[PDB]
Structure formats: structure tokens, C-alpha cells
Symmetry: C3
Subunit: 397 residues, 3 copies
Amino acid sequence: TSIHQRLDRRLSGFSLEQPFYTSPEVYALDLQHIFYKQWLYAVPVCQLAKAGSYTTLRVGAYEVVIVRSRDGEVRAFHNSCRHRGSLICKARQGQVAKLVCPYHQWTYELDGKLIWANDMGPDFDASKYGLKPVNLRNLDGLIYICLSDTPPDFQTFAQLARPYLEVHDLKDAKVAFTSTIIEKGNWKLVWENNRECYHCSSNHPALCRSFPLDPEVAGVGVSKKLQAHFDRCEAAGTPAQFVLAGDGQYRLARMPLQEKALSYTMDGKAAVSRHLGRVAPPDAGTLLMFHYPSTWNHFLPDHSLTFRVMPISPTETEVTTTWLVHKDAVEGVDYDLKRLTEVWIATNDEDREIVETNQQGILSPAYVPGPYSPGQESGVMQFVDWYAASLERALAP
Amino acid sequence: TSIHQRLDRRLSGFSLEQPFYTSPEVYALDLQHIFYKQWLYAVPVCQLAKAGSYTTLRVGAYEVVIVRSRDGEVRAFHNSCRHRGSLICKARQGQVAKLVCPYHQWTYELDGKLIWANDMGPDFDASKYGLKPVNLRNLDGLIYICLSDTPPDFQTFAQLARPYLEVHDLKDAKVAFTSTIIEKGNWKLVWENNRECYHCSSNHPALCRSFPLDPEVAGVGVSKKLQAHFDRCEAAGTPAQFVLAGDGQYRLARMPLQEKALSYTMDGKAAVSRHLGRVAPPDAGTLLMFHYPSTWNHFLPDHSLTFRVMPISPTETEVTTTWLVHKDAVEGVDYDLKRLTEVWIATNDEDREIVETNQQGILSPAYVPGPYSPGQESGVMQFVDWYAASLERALAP
Amino acid sequence: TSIHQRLDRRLSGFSLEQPFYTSPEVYALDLQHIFYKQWLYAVPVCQLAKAGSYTTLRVGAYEVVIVRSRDGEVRAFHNSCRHRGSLICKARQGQVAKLVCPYHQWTYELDGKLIWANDMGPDFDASKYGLKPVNLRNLDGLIYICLSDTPPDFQTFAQLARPYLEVHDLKDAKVAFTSTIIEKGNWKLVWENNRECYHCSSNHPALCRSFPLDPEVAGVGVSKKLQAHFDRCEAAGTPAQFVLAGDGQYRLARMPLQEKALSYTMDGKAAVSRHLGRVAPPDAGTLLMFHYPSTWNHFLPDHSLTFRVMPISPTETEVTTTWLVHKDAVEGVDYDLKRLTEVWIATNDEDREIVETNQQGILSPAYVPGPYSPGQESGVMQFVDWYAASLERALAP
Ligand code: PRO
Ligand code: PRO
Ligand code: PRO
Ligand code: FES
Ligand code: FES
Ligand code: FES
Ligand SMILES: [Fe+3]
Ligand SMILES: [Fe+3]
Ligand SMILES: [Fe+3]
């Protein structure tokens, strides 16, 4: 059975056939046609605040380095030397004056131009051997990249998202904490888990203290109560109402938290006393933003959280959670690290356990597609539809 | 060279060509056509004595759960939730009231029927979404399963084995100890090792104190001495003489132990003072039973041992040894755990070393089939013939 | 794109396309057509000085045992028993009277003849079941093997090398130390690294104290200064001038060390006070010998170092470094182990880091061939040309 035959018979109401989650064949297609073609969230721009600052990441098999250039522009490159291919930057982050290959010291400017290569002979043309650029955009303080030479339209998303994101002043953030975990499930299982709260009541004690179980929230006609919330926010100058992409790739909405909760903490109170941004009112709740295939995000009045989803193998996925706070917020004074991070550290661990257990069952040859809950899993169906449509379009002529 | 060409040129007197032991291709065929098609030993029924008791196991890629239902019947199911596929039972063993999926709490009765699924809509038909059954038989206190929807005949074996097994009263056993090891060799190498004692004199000091080296015993015209033993047993009402399957799949015989030994212990005396069963006389020896591809067994007058062979990868096999004693036998009083288990713990470790060393040599491209000993390895040839015949029949039309 | 199409478009001046370094497909071809076909360095003959002495090694998937036979000849065999295939010698080295299989004790003479096999029946012909020989040569105290039944010409190399190697009296050596490391890069990356010192100034502080950076040395018209060195050696009876194989497989030359250095030590002085061989004058420097694909070597006046390169996987290579000293040199008296070994232990660790970092960059799909330095990497181009030519010839008719 070919991939085309499986896609042909797929019904929207059901989980995917086994090979979509387990096969090296589909994994290769997901990299080739999804991760290597779409815009992806990389890191917050505040990680590149300093002169000569760089950060590195892997995307599938690609090695990327993002750097703050002399002119203050942030640029991304393939972290592969044009001589014999070596990584140039080995550390996760650092600062340099130039990009100097550790092997034979070919030396590049922070805009990628090759400025020195030792003893290469008279016929060497350094202009042919600069670092290969990676397409890059700045979404209001969040850096996105695209590995394709012909990137899709990012501007439609950027323009829609700006009014929602600008009130968070993310350019003025710092990273308070980063957590990187490997979940032993296919990247699609990580997404299907994220896009519903059908599992939340039984699995997430800590999160449920602040995050509502209502399908309207975690998932996808606006209820009167929800509309009232949007109106409180927007009367105060804080954009809140739904935005959903035409093709389903992204969504934004600012949702209410549980009864009286203001933040993702065990006591429901703000984690940080010096807020990141100018969000009002104080109970504006959580700005939810997803953008497939790389990221979901929760921006609160006091701090923000970004999540980055990267594929590792057919049955492994890396999830990176970053806590953003105001750059002038002081650990031990304006926030406590445990208080700030404990809810989502626990939640992520619970999701990982669930995803791994789901993956273990799916590996049985007895596993067959089952029906999603229309009421509780509309967001899961929405994701699976986006994925299948994306794959179909990429495989077409 | 195709699998069919290799099977075509195979001669009975020789070990198999390399790919049978090392190739992912043959490993996939062995799962598809052998392990996924034949009856397999799972666990003793005494593991499921209690109300709501369950046990889990993996067979190749299948995840199975065996449960004692309300009506007292033991049943097996695919341990994959009909919603999104999750394992339902994660522990090796336990007790439940219902089978409740840890993900979104779909809840099944112990007969597999789906009795509650939250918010699935008006068009949801729970009768289509019960757990998928796994075929199951009870061989006189030992649970066997078959992953095929069209299982082979088990009744012929069951009827032949009953008179031999019933005298052991296995329904009245408890598990005194279980040992699970991974041997780094193909499952067929584990079997070829088991089916001869050509290696025993040099490799098994402890076992040789009680287990005879005679090829007649470990392996396949009955000698006068052996016939005399069968007659002592059968005069006392204990079935002992050879039973061999028409197609070679299974064999039973009650064999004498070494000079004066009564059990598999370092001193040769019974391990347990309260015997499991009604075997007579006290020196009735060891009831040997194999059933390919999953199990060999030694049932003694005082206790019994079951062995389960499960494939892990082309060059890895899991062997599970279970010691059964009378349910009323008390550790520290009627038996000592070290005394009961030390002989076969050592023996299994020695076999593992031998199998791994054999596998290491076989991985050389210089390895070629060699001749089995007609006198010392007739049982190995018998196994290899059963395997090749089974594969041929499965590949045919 | 087929292997043939990649080979067709290859230009000499450039590093190889990705799959040559990363693909399982090319790895299989490199084993089949290079490692399994050419002469390979195994071990120094002094490891087999004693009666009944043996040593074992793996080459790709082959398991080899080399043994000193009763008649004093050194012979090699496939370390796979002719019965059911088991390794016979499990230890890295040892002494035996006979080669006795640990499984069922088939017993072979040290010339490989099967002299005892238990209970094999009347129709068993032991003359058909001796150990399979491996072709073997002794290069003046260094043992080389070839896994092909039709080995290439070794004599041309042997005759050229003898005058250079005989002055080292390697038959009179002992092994002072052996270091075995795994480098996480393709075997070709290990070679490309070895065949240039373009990386040395920045990466090898310790080695640079004694080993010149001059491209003439580490790499490939002889300079006046170098000729003067050759002449000092040869006037003293020590062969030194270049020898390069017609087909590029091997090279020998005795090169000067840095200003006043005599040996590879932190202080530049001889590591061992009792010299291995009769090399003169004392500042004769380092005899460099490579022989693709298995070995590079440095023979100094006081001690010698051999290096053996063996493939482990597409992105892993085992490098074994052996320090040879005079058999009568006493550790703690004539040499200090740290002083003798520290320079190359550090150097090998630095090379490993470089190779692994190079491999990591090459794994990016953005990696493309880049140009080698004509002045600094002529030896790298020479190796890559030898490799590609070897592969082309093996794939031809
Ligand atoms: O491992 C390294 O050195 C860089 C960091 C991100 C992945 N590649
Ligand atoms: O790992 C688990 O949770 C179950 C137990 C047997 C194999 N699958
Ligand atoms: O592992 C062993 O026992 C032998 C030693 C070299 C490789 N094979
Ligand atoms: S690989 Fe970067 S300078 Fe050589
Ligand atoms: S996967 Fe079992 S209830 Fe959802
Ligand atoms: S495998 Fe060597 S004697 Fe049997
Ligand atoms: Fe969750
Ligand atoms: Fe054994
Ligand atoms: Fe080096």
C-alpha cells in the first residue's frame, strides 16, 4: 500500500493509520515536505540581544546557526563550513567577533561572507564560498526560519499576529528558564495531545487549577461567556478574539483562566511581579497561539511561554519550553524559579508519559484508526486535516 | 538470492545459512509466519487466580493483556485502546475492576466490551469499539494464546498432553520466582542450543549433577533402561512414555535423572518439601515438554519450571523462566529460594553465554553451514526441519 | 542518483558528496570492495612471540584469529567454528595448546586442521572441516592480512618497504602500550584528517613541539633543506628518500622533526633510552609510512608507533595506536609510560574531536563538496583519488 493510497482513503473523523506514526518512510516525507518546507519557530530574539551573539539548533538533519550581525540585523546560516563541511559553532549559544571554523580556521563575517581562508591558491574565489543563508523572520520578538529556498508566505500570519503579540513587548524579555525534553512518540502524537483537553481532567492536576477544561479553550460560534471575556480584553485595548488561518496553519485567541486564576501557578497568582508587556486587564488570561508544525505558545499578562516541537526520529520528538519574563525582573525578588516553572514542568512530564504510552499501543499491529470526539477533539481533527492536506499538496504536481 | 532459493537448497543435516540467523528480512518472516500464526505459551494460570487480575506481555510488536473476567473465565485482548490506540494496562501485572484507558478514560468491562466513552456524540456505536480479542486456551494450568484470526488446531496437542500434565496439579501452583533474560542471539539459536546436550559436559557443571548427558534425554526405539523408567512411572499411574507430534511441533516424555538425583538442586534432593502435584514414584524424574516456537518445560515431582521464548530482534531473544511450586508451600519453611533456583539461574546464564558466542561467529561472512552430530544433535535437526517446513508452508499458496 | 553517476561527476579538487561519508549504501561498498579486498595491517608480530600465542580482531563483520603455530609460522584463520559457527577464541589475546571450540569442543591444530570432533558419525570427513585460512604476510615485523581468496600483489610494497623498516628491528620489539578509540566519523574522514597538517597549528599544541607544520612532511620536487636531511640519513646507512606507489596506495619517507626535537615527547628528547633498532644519526627524525586503507605509521630512532584504521559503521571508525619499544626496555627505568605516550594520546583525542565535528556538519543536507587547499591538502586529494579509483575499478567489469 502506497502513501497515496493511504491518503486517498483517509477520513477526517479518525486517527491515522499506523505507518503515519511509526514508519521511517513517512518520517522521511514529513521532514522533506513539512519541516524542510514550512516556517518554523526557532528561539526568542532576546537570546540574540548582545553584540556577536549566536545560538545553534538542529532541524531534522539540518544544523543552523542564528547570529546577531554587526549591523544589528539577526541572520541565520547553515552551520557547515564551506571548506570541508565542519560545524563552525559547536556550543548551544555564545558570542564571537567572527565565525571561525575550528578545523582550518576559515573565517567568516557575521553576515556570512568568507573573509579569510588560508593558502587556497590563486584560483580561489571567496565570493563563491560564503555561508549558505537560511531564510529568517522576526515575529514581534520571536525568530522563525525556513529551510526552503522558496519559502511560503509568512506575511499574512505576521500581520494577523502582530496586534496580539505586540502588547507583550517580547523584544524586552529575557529567558528565565528553558526545559528541553525528548518524548518517545511521533511528532504528530505530540500535536494531537496538545490540541485537546479531553485528557486533562485525569492527567494534569496542577494545570487544571488555572487552565479551563472547556473544549472551546484548548480546542477550536462564540459562547456568550467567552465573548464577554474577549470584550473585557478589547475594551482595555488588548486584542483577544479568534483569528484562524484560512488553511488552518495557525490560530490566536486570548482565553479566560479558571475562576480567579491569573497565571499558571499552583496558587493561581501572577508568577512575576514585574510584568512582561502591557496586557490589561490583569485577568486577561492566556493568549494561545499555535503555528504548525513547530510551535504552540501561551502569553500571559505577567510572563510568556513558548514551545518548540522538533522531530528526532519516527518515534521521538524534542519539545523545548522557554519561559520569558521582563528583562529587568530579578530572580529571587520579582519571581521565584520553582514557583514560575513548576506547573508546566509537571504538565510536560505528564504529557510525555501520555504520548509515550499512546505510542506504545500504536506500535501494535492490532492498532487501527479510532474515532475522535466531535465535542472534545475538534482541534485534533483540525490538526490532522492540516497535516494530510499539506502532505497531499507537497506530493502533487 | 531469494528466501525461496535458500529454502530450496537446504539439506536437513546442516546448520542454517547466515541470513536465517542474522537478516531483518528473515526476522520479519519469522514473526509474520511463525510467531504471529502459531499457538504460544504466555503465563501460568495461577498468575490470574484473583478477581480482576491481569498480566501483560509483548509478542514481537503485539501488546497483549490477559485478564480474569467476572465470570471466572480467563480472556486475552489486544492492549490497545480503540479510541487513539494507547496501552490500557501499563504494569506487568495487577488487579482492576474495569479496564480504564489512562489517556481519556474509555472504560471496558473485563470481557472487553466498551461500557463508557466520554462525549463521543450521538452517532457513536460502542458495540463497534470493544477491545479486540486474542485467541486463548488453558493447557491444564498453562495459558496459551494465538494472534491469528484463524488459529491452527490446538486440541490434538491439548488432548495428548493432558494425562501427562494433570498429575502436576498446575491450577494449584503459585509462582515462586521468575527470571527474565535477554540472550544476544537469534531465537533459532536459542532453540538449537536447547535441543541438544552435546554442549552440556563442558558448559553446565551444576545441571550435570542431576540431568543426564544421554542424547536420548535432551534429544529424540527406546533403550531397555529408559523403558524400565517409563514402566516404573506408569505402573504408579504417572504417564511417562514418548509422545511426539506428527508434524514435530511438540514432544513429551518423563525422563530419569542422574544416579539418585530427585530434583534440579546442587545436592540432588527435592527443592520443595510440599510437592506440586501427585507424581509417583519420588524418582519419576523430569517431564520434558516442548512446543515450538514458544516453550520448553521441565515438570518434576516437587516443583515445575516453564520457559518462554520470545523474539526481540534478529539477534536478540527474551527467555522467561518461571518456577512453580505448590500454592501452600512457604518460602523459608518448605523451600529456600536460592536452593530452588540456583541451578537453572546458572544454567541459563551459561546458555546465554554460549548462544551469544555462537551468534558472534555466525555474523562473520565466512560462516557456512556445518554438519550436525547424528548421535548428539538429532533434536537440533528435528527443530530446524520443523522450522523450515513451517516457513515453506506459510510461503506457499 | 546511482553510485556510478556520483563517481562519474567527481572532480579531484573537492571533498566528497555527502553519501560517501554518511550512507549505509556506500559503507557496504567500502567493506565489500576495499576492506574485504586489500591487504590490511593487523598487529605487530611481537604480539605472537610466544608458543601457542594468539590474537583476535574484527574487520568489518569478519572475525579473525592470528596464531603462532608449532612450526613457528604465524598463520591467520576465520574465527568461526566449522560445526555451528561459534567464535573459538573469545579473548583479545592469549596462549593455547590447541584451538578448542567452547561450544562442543571441536579441536583444531594451530595450523587449522580439525583433529578431534566428538561423535560425528562414520560419514564425517574431518579434512573438509578445518578452519578457513586468511591470507597473511609479515612486513618486517608487522602482520598484514587479506580477506580475499584472490589477494592483490603485496610483494611490490614489501620489497620497497624492507630497507626502510629493517633498520627498526621490529621483530625485537615489545608492545609498551596500546590505545583503542572510536571516532564518530566515517573512515574516510579519519584518513582525510590524517593526510594534512592544515589543521595542526590550531589543534595540536603538544604535537607541534616536535612535528613540523611544513606541507611537505604530513603531505606529499624535493626542497633543498629536505634533501639535506635525506642525505644525512642515507650517508649514515639509513634509507630516507621518498618512495611513492605507482597507484598511490602507499608512501614512505624519513622526515626531519622540529628544531632540535628527537622524538614525540613534550620536551623533544628521546622517550626511551634503549632504542628500538639501529637508526642513525640520532636526529634522523620520523619514518612516515602509510598504506591505504588500514594504516599509517611513525618509526622514530628510539621507539615506533603503528596506527590501524578499521570501519565500524558509516559514521564510526576504530583507531588503534600501538607504541613499540625494544623488548629489553624496562618501564620505569628506560622509559616512563606517561612521557612515552602523552603526546599521541592527546593528539588522537584532538583528531577525534575534529573528525566528529566535521562529521556533524557533513550530516546536514546543506553540506556540499568544497575545495581542498592545493598547498596544504595535496595529500588529502591524493587519498581521495586513490579511494575513488579503487572503487571505480572494483565496480567495473
Ligand atoms: O551539537 C552541536 O554542536 C550543534 C548545537 C546544535 C546542534 N548542533
Ligand atoms: O510496557 C508495558 O507497559 C506493557 C507491559 C508488557 C509490554 N507492554
Ligand atoms: O569479541 C570477541 O570475543 C572477539 C575478539 C575480537 C572480536 N571478536
Ligand atoms: S572544514 Fe572549516 S576550515 Fe576546513
Ligand atoms: S486513547 Fe484510550 S481513551 Fe483515548
Ligand atoms: S560450534 Fe564449535 S564445536 Fe560446535
Ligand atoms: Fe496535556
Ligand atoms: Fe544448555
Ligand atoms: Fe591531526
